[model samples]
Target chain A: GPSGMILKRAYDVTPQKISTDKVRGVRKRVLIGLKDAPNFVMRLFTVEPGGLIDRASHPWEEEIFVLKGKLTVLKEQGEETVEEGFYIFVEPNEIHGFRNDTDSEVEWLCLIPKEGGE
Target chain B: GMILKRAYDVTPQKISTDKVRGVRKRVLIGLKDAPNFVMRLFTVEPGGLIDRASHPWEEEIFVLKGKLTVLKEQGEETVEEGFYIFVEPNEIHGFRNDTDSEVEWLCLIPKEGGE
Candidate 1:
């Protein structure tokens, strides 16, 4: 890797509405992606109040850290509400999703394998 | 990783030495072997700092609270909350909390980088 690096505020990268299926009021900002990252993609997600991302699974693993507010996590087994400072690691192909059931928005950081996204 | 725990739920270990000071580190995850990444939470007291250094693996950081002055080869920059940083392999960098309040941040690095 070269000496180059990237440093920016979370909002420095404009948030984009998530176009994934079954998603609503969810926005994402790719802080680090395949373009320069060696092995992972770092993304910040904002789930508006009442927003939800329907259950979905992928071949890649997902590591998540809650940054703000409470978030309801839906899994194949059931659902659990996680608060700020909480972290979750989902195995590959494990079904998972998210919901912002609180009045305020939810923010989190998600890291996945570089190959997980295009 | 089956654990769904808060950063503080994990035991916090105070680490201080000649090169490190006023810092407490928590292993948020990466309890098992051969994991792809290890997540860590660090709390630095005011005036504390990590000696400038470089590593063999990449490091991804997100500021959780207060302000942090990052020491880079070129110079230093003070970043506040909500900042995200990516330091490539062998990149020289370090961290310091110059404010009156403590600084908190999350650091994720490749498994091999774990001590």
Candidate 2:
């Protein structure tokens, strides 16, 4: 036998809207993480219509999967609109941001490695 | 200005069914020297289930196109589509498909050094 937490639904977790001067209409939920698991974090992000997760960069990488709805990703110089069933990988220090120009909610699953890994 | 990979399609990848009786997986993106974590798609035939086993690795899963039954410490839980699940390292876990149609799902695991 083993010991850990099991969540049934992503909707059951409370959503926290990350507010800043550049980011808007975005709510985040930390889905999974235990005492033994400090190396990675699984987060769920919900961006409402007109939501924008301000352009930013980090020292670690990001793995993203579109769970629902559609959104436009702005990176480097150009941008592209992606819908559900899309997988995206972002490397360290790769400046990027997301916008929900569509008239619906956009939920994406993101996984990130802990900075300065434990 | 970005150099990330945009994989607009996943069905294009080939499927591999070996370990399990009717489960297949398509590796979307994974490289020995790639930048970030890799992504994989798993497909299970009706009445198919993963080989009951455990290892020193964690699993992060998402139900994409079908229902799945997970064998956990608390009996069994049938998770419908749109479920975000995570399994701890060395946790006894397996996936089962009892429906009448094929089941498709998304899975992500840290690189070997991290898994």
Candidate 3:
């Protein structure tokens, strides 16, 4: 499907809305097909100290890698700490939630596919 | 005022299920904590493919080694070794290994705070 698509350079995307959930703070920045290209979404999340995100699941699987701060993930198996250097994946429909146990906020990146089909 | 953190030597977890159209394949190495960005390392096997998917988030990616073919809703692009690419949200995208080699990539994601 490679036609004549010109490659775009990486640039800093301006900050947009700030979403406050019961468990953490979210700052949305770039998304696919916005000012840039399409098919991907990038988001920055600041999980407040001692904050817990509500248990939820999505049809699309999620890939999460801890960038900063310490986070505790509540899974069906139990609770696990995803430290600064750790990476974890939340499968589709897996009941999961996150909490910032550290004194500071936790920042992380979330990557989801743009296609809607499961 | 955000704190800093780093990681290394992350690994990939085998997929528990392998139903067609739904693949749970991943190999994560490390991550960095930044005020607004998080960097990550991932290792994918030969021919590993992340089916086209999207959300409100966008992503910037670098190919560490091997070769990758990324299919966007508009078109497709080939990311060879040492190449970089960026993807925005809700643009149907998928990646595949067209070569016999293994593929490794680094992903950087940024999101709004308190959303």
Candidate 4:
């Protein structure tokens, strides 16, 4: 009640288009945004079957928590499975990507610096 | 594989006091030398609660399991799993577990706020 708190269900927030290229069937919802908080932004993302977040890197690091389904993580080493209850940390400028190779949808919470997310 | 971690693998640290009760916290993803932001998991058992309080840093939360009744300035609301909450800095808020189940959530904050 300081007139600045944001409380809402994941789906209540509108989805934003992921500017990163080569994405398909991916929806991103900014639960906490740049203007809401000073240091970081919290986003909820759902990658449907056949969806992919193309390989990309930025100047800021990223922290992710898987919520549902299995995710195929594309990294420099190789592809790995990231399932529910698993969290990931990607260093700054470290190339990474996410894919939903299975039929089920994958959902996760992504946290990034204010500069990397809007 | 190098950057991935499982929440259950980490040991849970209990936080209990006159106000906060039956709460266990775990550092899901974070390091001392890391740059910024630490992900934490908190499980509040039935009849547990965290007293209304505010902090200098914002709290970003996502409810992972069970319905959690949150205390706000206006009133209390029961939020179900999959609900995400963003508490601005200095905004008064609290959490309570009224049902006969465990309430689990993820909290993200700047590195300085982590312990």
Give the per-residue lDDT of model 4 (tens digit) for B61-112.
Answer: 9999999999997788889998988888888899999999899999888887
Residue pairs with backbone overlap in model 4? none
Candidate 2, position A82, lDDT = 81
Query: How is the predicted docking of candidate 3 categorized under the CAPRI scheme?
Result: incorrect
Write model 1 residue lDDT over B4-109, tens digit each, in one string: 7788878889989888899999887675722477788999999998988988889999999999999998899999899999998898898899899999999988
Best by DockQ: 1
TM-score per prediction, in order, is: 0.94, 0.86, 0.48, 0.93
DockQ of each: 0.69, 0.44, 0.09, 0.62
TM-score ranking, high to low:
1, 4, 2, 3
lDDT per residue (tens digit) for residues B47-85 in model 2? 887755666667777787788888776667889887777
TM-score of 2: 0.86
- The complex in candidate 2 yields a DockQ of 0.44
Candidate 2: where is the Cα deviation over 4 Å?
A: A1-5, A34-36, A116-118, B1-8, B11-19, B33-36, B113-115
Model 1 DockQ class? medium
Write model 1 residue lDDT over A1-118, tens digit each, in one string: 5775678998889888986669998999999878878877799999999999999898877888999999999988889999999999888777899999989989999998788882
